[PDB]
Amino acid sequence: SEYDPEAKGRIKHLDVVTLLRRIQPPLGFGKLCPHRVACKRLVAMNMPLNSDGTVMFNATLFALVRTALKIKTEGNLEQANEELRAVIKKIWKKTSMKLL
Amino acid sequence: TFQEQGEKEYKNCELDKNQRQCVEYALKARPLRRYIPKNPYQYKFWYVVNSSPFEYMMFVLIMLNTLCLAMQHYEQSKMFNDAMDILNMVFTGVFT
């Protein structure tokens, strides 16, 4: 929310690397240069392919949570949503966008 | 016995307790803003207010006001009572 002025969902993606630099290593990345770790990792996992400067909070925080532990490879991304709909509580139709 | 009764939450077919505690915060979440104002004629004060130097000094005054409030003893001298009475005015004025 430091670069986010309101709560209108999607926010600018331009300064995502600078936003992540301020985060501690356990949640963010290492103290090394982001040019080797963060730059490649930002594209490494799956993201919702929205417009160029529209990326919403509940897909980035969820992505970091899923990257922290029990990381899964490509192809079985739908397995995560299956687990959420089989174990996690009511989605309230809010995970339709988070699925991709 | 209370802990054992609290261990019957068997949702761990694929995820442990930590994934049932940290991922749940993602489902129910909302980002709250900071309410940036406009008309920088007013933002000049806003920038001054929320700052490291401001809070510290303002949080040190409380410490000082508490110390002032924690010295009233029994049968205190008239000059001491007057000094404390006029010193309370200083802190009241600073806080207003």
Q: Which DSSP helix (H) or strand (E) runs through B49? A: helix B40-49
Using an 8 Å CB-CB cutoff, list chain B residues near A5. Answer: 33-34, 36
Count of Cβ atoms closer than 10 Å to residue A61 Cβ:
15
DSSP lists the bridge partners of residue A11 as: A55
> For A65, which residue in chain B has the nearest alpha carbon?
B23
The percent helix, strand, coil of chain A (3-state, each to 5) is 40, 5, 55
Q: How many CA within 13 A on the CB side of residue A48?
A: 21
Nearest-angstrom CA–CA distance, B15 and A88: 10
Q: Give contacts of A83 with chain B, Cβ < 8 Å.
A: 14-15
A83 with B14: Cβ contact below 8 A: yes
Nearest-by-Cβ selection for A87 from B15, B27, B33: B15
Quote the CA–CA distance of A60 and A11 in Å, as a whole number: 11
- Long-range contacts for A49-52 (Cβ within 8 Å, ≥24 apart)? A49/A100, A50/A10, A51/A10, A52/A13
Helix (H) / strand (E) element for B42: namely helix B40-49
CB A88 within 8 Å of CB B27: yes
Chain A nearest C-alpha distance from B4 (Å): 22
Helix axes B78-95, B52-69, angle to 10 degrees: 150
Bridge partner list, A56: A10
Among A87, A89, A93, most B C-beta atoms within 10 A, so best to mutate, is A87
Q: Which helix (H) or strand (E) holds A67?
A: helix A57-68
